[PDB]
Amino acid sequence: KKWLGTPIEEMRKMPRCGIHLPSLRPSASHTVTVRVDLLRAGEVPKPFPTHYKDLWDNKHVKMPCSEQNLYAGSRWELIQTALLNKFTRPQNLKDAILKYNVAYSKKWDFTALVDFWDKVLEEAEAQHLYQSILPDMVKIALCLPNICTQPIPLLKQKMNHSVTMSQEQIASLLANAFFCTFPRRNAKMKSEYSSYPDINFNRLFEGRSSRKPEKLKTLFCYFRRVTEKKPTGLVTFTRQSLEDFPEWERCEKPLTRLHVTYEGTIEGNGRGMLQVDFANRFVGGGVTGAGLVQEEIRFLINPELIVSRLFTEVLDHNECLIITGTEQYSEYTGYAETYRWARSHEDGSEKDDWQRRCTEIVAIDALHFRRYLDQFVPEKVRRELNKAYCGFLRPGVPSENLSAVATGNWGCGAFGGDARLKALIQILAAAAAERDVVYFTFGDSELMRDIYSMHTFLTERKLDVGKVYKLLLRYYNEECRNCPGPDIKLYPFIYHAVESS
Ligand SMILES: Nc1ncnc2c1ncn2[C@@H]1O[C@H](COP(=O)(O)OP(=O)(O)OC[C@H]2O[C@H](O)[C@H](O)[C@@H]2O)[C@@H](O)[C@H]1O
C-alpha cells in the first residue's frame, strides 16, 4: 500500500479552489514592477515605468546600473566594457568578472567553472555556451536598466509587503548575479547587507566539488530557455510577518484531512498545492555555494526563487516568504552528492488572472538542533507551530479557497528534527489555518503508517488542537524533563495517555 488517508483527488488544489482575484495594482504594501493595464496572456509584460528611475538607499536594492555605483568612475560602464568582450576560454569570463571586482581577484577561485567548460562539457556544447548563451546572457544583463526600471524595495524584517515582477525582469537580475555585478554584496565585515543572503554567484565557481557542474548545468538550462524564448508570466514575492499567534493550549479548532504517502515528492506530486520549502533563515540556503539539499534543489529547478535573495532579509521567528508563480525549468535525479541534472522540464501549469503560474511555494525555516531532545521543550514546540502556522496562514482568505499543504519531513535532515513530532506540529499548524495536509515521507514507509495511525487515532477521539498540544506539553514534563534517553517515544505515549482516561 503506497498511500494512506483521504485520496489526493479530493484535496483542494489551484486554480480550481482559487478566489476571484482583485485587479492587480500598486499600493503602499504592494510594489508592481509592470504595466497592469497592458498585462496579457502569452505576451511579455511591459515594465513600469518606461524609463529607468534610480534609488540608492537603505530601503531599496542597490542596482548595478545606478549612476551612484562608482569605482568619479562609473562601475556600470566598467561592467559593460568588461562583459562586451568575446569569451573563447574560461579565463576570459574570470578576468571579465574580476575587472569590476578587483578586491576579490585573489579570493575567488574559478576552478569549478574551468572544469565544467573544458572537461564535463563536450566541444559542441562548450562552443554553444560562448557563442549563443553567454553573449545572450550579457545582453539581458546589460538590458537591466531598460527592464528593471522601477527600484526594488528590500523586504526587511517586520515588513508585510509584496513585490510582483515579470519573469523577464527576474531573468535580467539573475543574469547580473551570475556575472557578480551587484555592488556591496561580497564583503565579509559587511555593511548594509550582513543580514541578507549572498546574491552574486561567485561561490558557484569555487573548488573541486563534483556537484558544482550539475548546478551549472541546471542554471544554464534556465539561462538558455529565457534567452532563446522570453517567458511572459508574473511572480509575486510576499513577506508575511505575524505579531500575534494562537494560544495553542486553548485552541478549539478541529484537525483537518490528511493524505500521506512514501511515494513522490512535494514538487512532483503536490501540483497546484501550497508547497513547503524547508528553508534556512537566509532564504535559499547555500544555493549559490555548497548546499544541495531540498531547498537548494528547489531553488535550482525553480531558479526564479533565487532572486528572492537579492531583497529578502533574514527571516525572524515569526516570518515566512511566500512565492507564487515560479516556473520549473529542469528535472533532477538524485540528492545532495548524488544530485544530477536530468532533462529540461516543460511546465504546463495554468496561470491565474494575474498571469502567475499556479505554483505557490512558502519558505519556512525549522530550527537546527544540536541535540535530539531539545525539540520537545514547549518553547521549541511553540516556535515551530508558529513558524508553520505563519507559513500556512492566509489572513482574510476563506478556507474553502485555500489549497491543501504539500509538505514533508520539515527540519528532519540537515536540521536534526524528529519526523514524528514535526509531522504532528504541521498537522496542528494546518488545522489552526484550516488547511488540509498532503505529507511526503520520502521513502520511509513506517513513518507513513505511524503518522496515518496517529492522525486516524486523534480524529476518532475528536481532539481539538488544544488537547493535542496539551499532550505534547504533558510528554515533555512527564517523560522528557526528568530524563539516559527518554523511556517512551512520543507516539506510544499519546496512545497510552488518551486510552488511560
Ligand atoms: N523533494 C522532496 N520532497 C519531499 N520531501 C523531501 C524532498 N527532499 C527532501 N525531502 C525530505 O525532507 C528532509 C529535509 O531534510 P532537509 O532537505 O535537509 O531540510 P531540513 O529542514 O532538515 O534542513 C534544511 C537546511 O538545509 C538546507 O541547506 C536549508 O537551507 C537549511 O539550511 C529530507 O531528509 C527528506 O526526508
Author numbering: 444 to 514, 525 to 936, 939 to 956
Task: Quote the passages of the study that discuss this structure, keeping the authors' original sentences.
Reversal of PARylation is predominantly carried out by poly(ADP-ribose) glycohydrolase (PARG) in nucleus and cytosol, whereas ADP-ribosylhydrolase 3 (ARH3) may play a role in mitochondrial PAR degradation. PARG comprises an N-terminal regulatory/targeting domain and a C-terminal catalytic domain. The mouse PARG catalytic domain has a bean-shaped structure, with the active site in a deep cleft in the middle on the abdominal side.
ADPr or ADP-HPD binds to the active site cleft of mPARG. Residue Glu748 forms a hydrogen bond with the 2″-OH, while the key catalytic residue Glu749 side chain carboxyl group is very close to the 1′-OH of the ADPr or the C1″ of the ADP-HPD. The second conserved glycine rich loop (GCGAFGGD) interacts with the diphosphate group of the ADPr or ADP-HPD. On the adenine-linked ribose side, the adenine ring interacts extensively with mPARG. In contrast to bacterial PARG in which the 2′-OH of the adenine-linked ribose is buried, the same 2′-OH group in mouse PARG structure is exposed to the solvent, which would allow mPARG to bind (n+1) ADPr.
